[PDB]
Amino acid sequence: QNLKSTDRAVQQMLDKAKREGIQTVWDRYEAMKPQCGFGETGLCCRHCLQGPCGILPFGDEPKVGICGATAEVIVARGLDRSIAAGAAGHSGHAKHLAHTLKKAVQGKAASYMIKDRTKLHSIAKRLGIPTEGQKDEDIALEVAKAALADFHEKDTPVLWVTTVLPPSRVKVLSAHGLIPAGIDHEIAEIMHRTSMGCDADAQNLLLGGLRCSLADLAGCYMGTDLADILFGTPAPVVTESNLGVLKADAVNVAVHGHNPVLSDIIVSVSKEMENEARAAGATGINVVGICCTGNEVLMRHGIPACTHSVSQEMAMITGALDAMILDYQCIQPSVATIAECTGTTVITTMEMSKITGATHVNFAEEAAVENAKQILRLAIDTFKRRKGKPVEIPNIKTKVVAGFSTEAIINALSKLNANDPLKPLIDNVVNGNIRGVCLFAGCNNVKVPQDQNFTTIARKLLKQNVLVVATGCGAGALMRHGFMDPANVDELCGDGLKAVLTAIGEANGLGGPLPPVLHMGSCVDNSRAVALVAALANRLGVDLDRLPVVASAAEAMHEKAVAIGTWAVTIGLPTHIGVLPPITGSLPVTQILTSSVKDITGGYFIVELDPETAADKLLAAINERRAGLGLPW
Amino acid sequence: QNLKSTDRAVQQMLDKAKREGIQTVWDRYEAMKPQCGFGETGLCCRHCLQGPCGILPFGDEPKVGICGATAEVIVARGLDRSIAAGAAGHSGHAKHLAHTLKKAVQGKAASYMIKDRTKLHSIAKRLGIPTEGQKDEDIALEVAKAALADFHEKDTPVLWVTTVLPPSRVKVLSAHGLIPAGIDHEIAEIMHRTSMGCDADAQNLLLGGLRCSLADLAGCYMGTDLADILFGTPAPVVTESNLGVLKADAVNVAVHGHNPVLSDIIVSVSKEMENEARAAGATGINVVGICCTGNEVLMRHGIPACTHSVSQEMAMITGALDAMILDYQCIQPSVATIAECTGTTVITTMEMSKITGATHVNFAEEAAVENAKQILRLAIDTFKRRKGKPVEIPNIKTKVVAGFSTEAIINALSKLNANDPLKPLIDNVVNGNIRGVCLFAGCNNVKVPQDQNFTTIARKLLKQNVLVVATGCGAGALMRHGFMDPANVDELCGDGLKAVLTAIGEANGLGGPLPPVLHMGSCVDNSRAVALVAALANRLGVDLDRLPVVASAAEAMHEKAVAIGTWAVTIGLPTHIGVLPPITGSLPVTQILTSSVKDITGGYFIVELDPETAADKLLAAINERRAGLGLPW
Ligand code: SF4
Ligand code: SF4
Ligand code: FES
Ligand code: FES
Ligand SMILES: [Fe+3]
Ligand SMILES: [Fe+3]
Helix, strand or coil: CCECCCHHHHHHHHHHHHHCCCCCHHHHHHHHHHCCCCHHHEEEEEEECCEECCCCCCCCCCCCCCCCCCCCHHHHHHHHHHHHHHHHHHHHHHHHHHHHHHHHHCCCCCCCCCCHHHHHHHHHHHCCCCCCCHHHHHEEEHHHHHHHCCCCCCCCCCHHCCCCCCCCHHHHHHCCCCCCCCCHHHHHHHHHHCCCCCCCCCHHHHHHHHHHHHHHHHHHHHHHHHHHHHHCCCCCEEEEHHHCCCCCCCEEEEEEECCCCCCCHHHHHHHHCHHHHCCCCCCEEEEEEHHHHHHHHHHHHHCCEEEEEHHHHHHHHHCCCEEEEEECCCCHHHHHHHHHHCCCECCCCCCCCCEEECCCCCCCCHHHHHHHHHHHHHHHHHHHCCCCCCCCCCCCCEEEEECCHHHHHHHHHHHHCCCCCCHHHHHHHHHHCCEEEEECCCCCCCCEECCHHHHHHHHHHHHCCCCCEHHHHHHHHHHCCCCCCHHHHHHHHCHHHHHHHHHHHHHCCCCCCCCCEEEEEECCCCCHHHHHHHHHHHHHCCCCCCEEEEEECCCEEEEHHHHHHHHHHCCCCEEECCCCCCCCCHHHHHHHCCCCHHHHCCCEEEEEECCCHHHHHHHHHHHHHHHHHHCCC | CCCCCCCCCHHHHHHHHHHHCCHHHHHHHHHHHCHHHHHHHEEECCCCCCCECCCCCCCCCCCCCCCCHHHHHHHHHHHHHHHHHHHHHHHHHHHHHHHHHHHHHCCCCCCCCCCCHHHHHHHHCCCCCCCCCCHHHHHHHHHHHHHHHHCCCCCCCCCCHHHCCCHHHHHHHHCCCCCCCCHHHHHHHHHHHHHHCEECCHHHHHHHHHHHHHHHHHHHHHHHHHHHHHCCCCCCCEEEHHHHHHCCCCEEEECCCCCCCCCHHHHHHHHHHHHHHCCCCCCCCCEEHHHHHHHHHHHCCCEEEEHHHHHHHHHHCCCCCCCCEEECCCCHHHHHHHHHHHHCEEEEEEEEEEEECEEECCCCCCHHHHHHHHHHHHHHHHHHHHCCCCCCCCCCCCCEEEEECHHHHHHHHHHCCCCCCCHHHHHHHHHHCCCCCEEECCCCCCCCEHHHHHHHHHHHHHHCCCCEEEEHHHHHHHHHHHCCCCCHHHHCCCCHHHHHHHHHHHHHHCCCCCCCCCEEEECHHHHHHHHHHHHHHHHHHCCHHHHECCCCCCECCEHHHHHHHHHHHCCCCCECCCCCCCCCCCCHHHHHHCCHHCCCCCCCCCCCCCCHHHHHHHHHHHHHHHHHCCCCC
């Protein structure tokens, strides 16, 4: 089981699944091997009914697609389509929040409201929207109108790109025609250009991909901003993670997926439904989190995290999960089958995201609280059905400190310098206490033993004094292995990083250091690390491609992660990916994405499947940036 | 060579290619076999880095994707993505025309103008735009603003759907939530819902696909309307087709691709550049057409058609093609390689559609005429370089009567009944002279011997008195085998159809019948047959799914053809596809698309690879509609 996951509770549940004959993601992976080399390398195209076209990586024919598409064209077109799909996911998340805010301030969804008015004012000022003498409701109405308008062509380019990156960075990208014209415009234009008999030049295609990745960034940043306006900006919180956060004696309700719009309401309504759950004979309603929706309610409300990503099925294997409430993205459709063996009620709520065999509750913001009650009532019923059943929850959980938004980080730092809060952090970079900054992002991938790359690379970087922040299921992997527990700072962090974490935490009324890794939220909250990095850039006078900041999608799975890696490259970062992406069938494209892109954006991909090597390479990139600033290392 | 193409000039040029060692689409196809069964059946998914996932059509494992995606989910998601790519192509075509019209009437692109003011007024009235007391330039400005606005969410659904279908049809589609909210909105939402861990219900996914296909329809209809405003509505014209339209003694310039925006300017400017071409020693500039751009200038200006689709390379094999001017869509990137053997200058003109090895001319509407001169000058130079070279143009050409827009058809019919022009046509349906109507649409596919399905099915339907109309490369296939030559009416058409064609043509000052097949334009001008069918629906009081109208993508290749077949099904038509689409790996999805979709839209797919069988099935569907109206058959 140790080749499947490094998580001990996941191993316990894999044993139970094998005992009980429940098929798992790892079993389906085992039945899939050997996987196809054409697809694995990118050398396969189906954008034509003349296809499929396979191109051998090496040897004799076939050497070219039927229409004459070369290997680099096929590879570049495939990658471009996956960037557009990732952009479309983060896009739809943010679009739906934009509609929710619009509905809220127009009196149509009373379950929603402006919870963060300082943020609303910040965003409106950054966008050039006038605040002075305006009603909050009208400022928010303008901010939502701008959000929706960034999806199409207009007078201006995408404001959630051009107003969130330092002007020098915007000038670099715009001299290469990389500034998106509208989010959905870019997605559709990718789909156009990559269809048969269109763009057939790898450089041209990859430039389009960089532009589309920035559309994805805009969607992430939009979603973050709007969820913060709607639901509050995260501040540091203490909670727990892993399967042991489940309780045999409560109604256990997992919120799963990505959009917090419904699950924040679920969190707030379950509090009221406590008394009714307890009339059914439960101790209460125990809302836990899975994947990014879970991270949203962990960041804002301290909801404990049950599990993430490749291991989501294992929550159900305990027999104590009574409801799994989905919205969309990264939900294994297998849950709906597995529920028939475990008694969990799987509930979808989004019209475009349904799974055959799952109960559907048609969620509308205009009836949010009503929907919530209905859904939790189903959960309560399911708990009744397992009154006295034996459950096996592994008694494994870690302590998690999280809620480190960029605003929270800046406030924490301001306790060391109120008038120039980024300065303490910059000072410790300059004197070597902080070697650089590494963002861990992305998901788990069944091909990599779960969390192994995240934890190995993290361990090496922390010993070398790299400040580590994390999002999405990368945050999830690090939190389930103790990396967000301050009590591990001694074992994990080199002396200088230890000193800075201790200084900031003791200055923040915690009596202890900050945790070894700063949890910055969901996959859309990858934009938060942009806002931090951008701010450092601005405070220092230099473009992003000169900062000792790096990013690692250590176990990337989802098309969203490919779009995110591509916009970490486009805004200027060295960007490790720890899973093989479908680029190795073409040397020209690999060369562009790992080398010559440096001469356009300053970022570049680092493709490295071995995590010790990947950590060396990330440390080398950080130290190259240090030397470029004239710093020691 | 006869198993490759049924076109005699294509066979001559295949012989020359084999002689001279030039690789062709058919050779690359031969090197591709045996093709992959997973892709061919749809049972393959790469929307995850955990992939590729192959699912055996039959047998043991693998039976499910790694994430638990079933076979019908994988198949439905693949098909949905190809509908969105087709929609994105027709979408971008129409978007670019919308921007061109906007630029024209704002004084920014003087090479463009309102050429059809009657059409502009029609469109503005159909859209609810006010015409009375308005400047043309301001009406057109409103019409372009509405065009651009149909790409995103707004007060209203997509007007190029809801104002072009009969209200009963709009009510049917809207009771199923199939009315698109914005063209690019639908494309992005498909990309969202089909990415990993989202929609996992085949019915839900296929309903999304129908909605996206209607976005594609909107894009087609928009593109038609705007090109008609900008460039004139086609009226009947006489021209020629096939390779013999090339002339050894002229500068031979092929316009190739889909957007007429540049090639109409090329047509008009080459007239002036005649004298300069003839100073180089040519007889003149001979502009010929390939694929849909060619069909646009054939429809409007009588430009002769050289070739289409699977056989486009053969134009270059003559050695007499001096320039091939591309915009985008269905251009085999092989042209750019083959040009090095044939001396043709391949010129791309669109920023998102470049081919490695081709000269790029950056075309801007604001400098259209200038760009044209530059491009034709390159053509002229290339002609000089082959002064005295031997060329082999096959002396094979057919006579083509074309330009049968819906307006042209209605005018022609109005010579038999001025006050009720659809009535003569309806009368002859009712008395059996016209059995029904069949639209041939789509491309050629290297798997089908070129034009064989189009010509076989056409022959059978014409003998049974079916009125046949055609677009795109289906129009191309029928025109190159004589089906748009009135002199073949006797050999081709049954007695009643012959009588109606003779009556209309002799009433239209032609002294002969109309041609056996009505050429209605490009792939976007598939919308023209909608406008005709809709009008018949409205004139008769019945929904489209009650008319004896059918559609056949007899040799479909491009993702655009899949979107077109899907919106011919969604607006209510029996819709034959003559190439295997990637649906056979899932019986549920095949059942939905060929049977149970009848109970939603009234249309259905007819998948039939044998053309004699396909013609039987199309005749049976037409006669089923006849019986449903209570007619004889
Ligand atoms: S677009 Fe080209 S490479 Fe792709 S399937 Fe079609 S013929 Fe093959
Ligand atoms: S989305 Fe599912 S079926 Fe598709 S590649 Fe990923 S794991 Fe396999
Ligand atoms: S041949 Fe395996 S990915 Fe297509
Ligand atoms: S396995 Fe051949 S299409 Fe993927
Ligand atoms: Fe996840
Ligand atoms: Fe074509």
